[PDB]
Amino acid sequence: TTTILMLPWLGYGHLSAFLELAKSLSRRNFHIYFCSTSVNLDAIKPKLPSSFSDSIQFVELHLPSSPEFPPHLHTTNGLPPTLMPALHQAFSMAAQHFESILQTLAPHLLIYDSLQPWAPRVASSLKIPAINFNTTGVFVISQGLHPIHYPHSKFPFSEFVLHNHWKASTERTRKRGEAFLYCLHASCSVILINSFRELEGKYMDYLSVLLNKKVVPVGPLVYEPNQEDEGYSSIKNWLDKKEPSSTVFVSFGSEYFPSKEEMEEIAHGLEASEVNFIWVVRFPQEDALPKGFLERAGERGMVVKGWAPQAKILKHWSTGGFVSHCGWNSVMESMMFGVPIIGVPMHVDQPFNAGLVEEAGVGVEAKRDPDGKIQRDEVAKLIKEVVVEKTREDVRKKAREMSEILRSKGEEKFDEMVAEISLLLKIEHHHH
Amino acid sequence: TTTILMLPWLGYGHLSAFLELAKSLSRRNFHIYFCSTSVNLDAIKPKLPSSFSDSIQFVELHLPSSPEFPPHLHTTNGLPPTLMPALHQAFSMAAQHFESILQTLAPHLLIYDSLQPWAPRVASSLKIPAINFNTTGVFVISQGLHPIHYPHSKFPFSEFVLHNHWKATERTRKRGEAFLYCLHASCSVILINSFRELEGKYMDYLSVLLNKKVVPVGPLVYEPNEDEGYSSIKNWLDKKEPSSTVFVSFGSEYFPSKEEMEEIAHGLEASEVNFIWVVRFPQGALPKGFLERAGERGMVVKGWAPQAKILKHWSTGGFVSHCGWNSVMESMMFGVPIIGVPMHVDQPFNAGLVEEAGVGVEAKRDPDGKIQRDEVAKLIKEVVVEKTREDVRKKAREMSEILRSKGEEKFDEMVAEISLLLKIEHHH
Numbered sequence: 001t002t003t004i005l006m007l008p009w010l011g012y013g014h015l016s017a018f019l020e021l022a023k024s025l026s027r028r029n030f031h032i033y034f035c036s037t038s039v040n041l042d043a044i045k046p047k048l049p050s051s052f053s054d055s056i057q058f059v060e061l062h063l064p065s066s067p068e069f070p071p072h073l074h075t076t077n078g079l080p081p082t083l084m085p086a087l088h089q090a091f092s093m094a095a096q097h098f099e100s101i102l103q104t105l106a107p108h109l110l111i112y113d114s115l116q117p118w119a120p121r122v123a124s125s126l127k128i129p130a131i132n133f134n135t136t137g138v139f140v141i142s143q144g145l146h147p148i149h150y151p152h153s154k155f156p157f158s159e160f161v162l163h164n165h166w167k168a169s170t171e172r173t174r175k176r177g178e179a180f181l182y183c184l185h186a187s188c189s190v191i192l193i194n195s196f197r198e199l200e201g202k203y204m205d206y207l208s209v210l211l212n213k214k215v216v217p218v219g220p221l222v223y224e225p226n227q228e229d230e231g232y233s234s235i236k237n238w239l240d241k242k243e244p245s246s247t248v249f250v251s252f253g254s255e256y257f258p259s260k261e262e263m264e265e266i267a268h269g270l271e272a273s274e275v276n277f278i279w280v281v282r283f284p285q286e287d288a289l290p291k292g293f294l295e296r297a298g299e300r301g302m303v304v305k306g307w308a309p310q311a312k313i314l315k316h317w318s319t320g321g322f323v324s325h326c327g328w329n330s331v332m333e334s335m336m337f338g339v340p341i342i343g344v345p346m347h348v349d350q351p352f353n354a355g356l357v358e359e360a361g362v363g364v365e366a367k368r369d370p371d372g373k374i375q376r377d378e379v380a381k382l383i384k385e386v387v388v389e390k391t392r393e394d395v396r397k398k399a400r401e402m403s404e405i406l407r408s409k410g411e412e413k414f415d416e417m418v419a420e421i422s423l424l425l426k427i428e429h430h431h432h
Numbered sequence: 433t434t435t436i437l438m439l440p441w442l443g444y445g446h447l448s449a450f451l452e453l454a455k456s457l458s459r460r461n462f463h464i465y466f467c468s469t470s471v472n473l474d475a476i477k478p479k480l481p482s483s484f485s486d487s488i489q490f491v492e493l494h495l496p497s498s499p500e501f502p503p504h505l506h507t508t509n510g511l512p513p514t515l516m517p518a519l520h521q522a523f524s525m526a527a528q529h530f531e532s533i534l535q536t537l538a539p540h541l542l543i544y545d546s547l548q549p550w551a552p553r554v555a556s557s558l559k560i561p562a563i564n565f566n567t568t569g570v571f572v573i574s575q576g577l578h579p580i581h582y583p584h585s586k587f588p589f590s591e592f593v594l595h596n597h598w599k600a601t602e603r604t605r606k607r608g609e610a611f612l613y614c615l616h617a618s619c620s621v622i623l624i625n626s627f628r629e630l631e632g633k634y635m636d637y638l639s640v641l642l643n644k645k646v647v648p649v650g651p652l653v654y655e656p657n658e659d660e661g662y663s664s665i666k667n668w669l670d671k672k673e674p675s676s677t678v679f680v681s682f683g684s685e686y687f688p689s690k691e692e693m694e695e696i697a698h699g700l701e702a703s704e705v706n707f708i709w710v711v712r713f714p715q716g717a718l719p720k721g722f723l724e725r726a727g728e729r730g731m732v733v734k735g736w737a738p739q740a741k742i743l744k745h746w747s748t749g750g751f752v753s754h755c756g757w758n759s760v761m762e763s764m765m766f767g768v769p770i771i772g773v774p775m776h777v778d779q780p781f782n783a784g785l786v787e788e789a790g791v792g793v794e795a796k797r798d799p800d801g802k803i804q805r806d807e808v809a810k811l812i813k814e815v816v817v818e819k820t821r822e823d824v825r826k827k828a829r830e831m832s833e834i835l836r837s838k839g840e841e842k843f844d845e846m847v848a849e850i851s852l853l854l855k856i857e858h859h860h
């Protein structure tokens with residue numbers, strides 16, 4: 001009877017994190033209007049069981065469309081990188097439809113993602129409380145805000161150094177302005193963040209000071225797969241043949257297409273390691289591999305095209321490593337399932353995520369050269385040490401300990417969020 | 433706000449399972465009146481975080497008391513077996529106070545344990561829906577109800593055979609309960625503290641046996657955060673090698689005989705395993721040189737121990753248990769193989785369940801029904817000291833992984849059933 005409209009950013013990782021939060025809120029008696037573009041809603045629907053049909057309603061947000069930019073392309077998932085400016089521009093023009101949705105549905109609360117300036121603002125003009133759910137980690141945000149207040153001083157609690165490659169406009173201009181966003185309401189005085197104290201507790205305390213905001217951990221939000229084959233049955237038979245802890249899963253996410261040069265280094269490092277591997281290779285919605293590489297690999301390697309059951313593969317006992325771009329959800333999934341990460345970060349928050357994995361001791365990062373390039377030798381050495389020869393038992397011990405901590409978490413994970421939301425509603429009700 | 437009054441039986445294990453269910457219900461916006469005797473309410477209160485103070489309220493049930501049978505004895509936890517007659521009798525006399533509580537609180541729903549026949553009768557008189565929560569396993573009940581309808585036919589899905597020792601007032605009441613009638617939505621469904629991976633077939637059979645919907649809510653395992661008592665135990669365990677130590681406990685309601693204790697002690701000593709043994713005495717023992725010989729390998733804790741914390745310690749590789757249900761659930765959740773030494777009541781069935789599942793082993797009693805030191809020593813060496821029963825250790829890890837993987841969906845079926853029955857019975 002208390003309704004919440006949830007608005008993820010367009011992007012599969014954001015959609016997944018919001019959906020898991022939606023399920024918890026639905027179980028706690030909130031009615032959820034889960035709002036996204038049709039293609040994203042369709043992509044995420046397999047993960048919502050029929051049990052939620054009454055409580056979580058999928059609500060379509062309409063973006064401007066054209067015959068060459070139809071609604072199927074209204075997502076970052078597999079989007080050609082050049083079409084990305086159109087996606088932000090079309091999303092920029094979806095505010096009027098969003099306003100119509102809010103006026104009609106009249107939700108008691110809005111939970112919104114961090115790439116929609118208009119979303120809280122539209123909610124505000126209709127006197128609807130709104131709260132920010134940040135689907136990614138704490139470490140990156142605190143590192144972003146720390147220079148503002150301390151241009152000369154050292155970042156506390158970490159020895160991480162950003163590589164010069166990442167250290168080196170319209171979105172950047174937008175992000176900087178967002179650092180100085182004001183708050184005169186209860187709803188904007190707290191944020192929900194998809195992390196947990198055993199990994200980021202010090203950073204969460206620091207972030208709250210930097211923001212003057214309550215920081216509520218609600219994570220990690222890891223989707224647990226069930227018993228349609230998206231190729232698992234074929235893959236499960238292949239994995240069953242392998243030795244325990246002998247295989248690496250290779251993925252670079254739902255939004256990034258590695259360069260021909262980058263994938264050459266990844267493939268050569270994979271071949272030199274002599275590891276088993278399942279590599280998901282994607283093309284905008286082999287010809288990108290070194291010649292003879294898949295033949296030289298033979299049955300040691302399997303390439304899955306387009307999409308793979310990532311969570312299921314990570315849970316298989318043959319999997320001993322995750323060569324990953326270190327997108328937050330993949331990092332959270334690997335930690336939940338106890339698979340050590342061999343980090344190959346690409347852009348955005350991923351280098352920060354790789355550093356976090358490295359200090360925690362659960363995984364390792366393949367360092368780039370001074371010119372910012374992937375190194376096949378570094379890729380080969382880490383897979384040999386972590387997976388093939390298992391000379392990094394410290395990393396494997398830390399990963400298992402971390403998994404046990406994460407598995408140990410129960411429904412208390414959401415208690416602080418529930419208490420804050422109830423306060424939010426009671427306060428804003430009086431001031432309308 | 434929908435209000436539920438929960439009435440566990442007076443055993444600590446029943447209190448623990450009810451409290452975990454109460455937390456699940458509280459998080460789903462039900463107000464909980466948690467009702468039991470003062471001694472029991474005080475006993476479990478440390479496991480209830482302060483955040484639940486608003487949503488879970490402890491409501492005292494008064495049993496008749498005398499100077500020699502004071503309220504601190506109104507529990508089966510540590511009770512002298514010679515006072516069980518008095519405990520059951522006083523419990524029966526508390527029915528009038530229960531009615532006064534229900535009349536005042538007027539809960540929307542009563543969740544009652546399967547040991548209090550007056551509780552559903554008081555509830556029916558006050559027009560309060562009441563649903564049965566069974567804290568223990570499915571297997572024992574289906575095993576109890578199968579001969580009624582199928583004499584001359586063996587139990588359909590198990591190769592378990594009860595030992596003669598166990599085949600050799602309460603039973604009279606229990607037998608009548610098998611035929612109790614249901615004419616209401618509240619009695620048409622029962623919540624049980626189990627999970628289909630271990631008892632799925634038995635649940636389906638029990639549903640037919642009872643003509644009732646069986647809703648699994650388990651396993652309900654308390655995950656821990658004396659408080660300083662662990663500090664001494666943790667230091668000792670930290671010196672041990674990984675998976676080198678057995679925890680030994682026989683529960684809150686049974687005191688093994690001197691002969692039983694000696695067989696267990698000699699089995700431990702011969703095995704040469706590291707061990708933590710909780711030895712307790714009734715409210716208000718070992719071979720002569722046992723501890724001296726054991727030395728650093730052996731530690732005895734008196735009265736009560738932090739079972740869950742010890743079981744999660746990496747040094748712990750085995751649990752010698754009496755096989756009470758909650759202890760079995762905890763061992764499976766934490767991946768510790770059970771070395772079963774069942775004593776009485778439902779424990780033999782639970783031990784048989786553990787063995788067939790493959791997560792643990794059962795120490796067999798001799799033809800006269802006695803504990804055998806040789807059997808105890810053999811199993812511990814096979815499972816803990818010399819890990820030759822790797823099939824058992826593998827199955828235990830798999831089971832813990834299954835249990836740890838379970839999430840909030842565990843309670844969806846219960847919540848739907850409660851919603852339905854309340855709406856149905858409201859109309860009448």
Ligand SMILES: O=c1ccn([C@@H]2O[C@H](COP(=O)(O)OP(=O)(O)O)[C@@H](O)[C@H]2O)c(=O)[nH]1
Pocket residue numbers: 011012013014016251252253254255256280306307308309310311326327328329330331333
């Ligand atoms: O072949 C694939 C690729 C990705 N994923 C899932 O898609 C999400 C990716 O989110 P993440 O934050 O890891 O990275 P992003 O795509 O946002 O860069 C994760 O849940 C992955 O498990 C998947 O199931 N199969």
Ligand SMILES: O=c1ccn([C@@H]2O[C@H](COP(=O)(O)OP(=O)(O)O)[C@@H](O)[C@H]2O)c(=O)[nH]1
Pocket residue numbers: 443444445446448681682683684685686710735736737738739740755756757758759760762
């Ligand atoms: O020294 C002890 C003995 C028991 N327990 C707890 O008490 C419960 C035992 O319940 P069970 O159903 O296994 O046996 P019962 O006492 O009912 O026979 C479990 O939570 C144990 O972890 C404990 O904490 N410390």
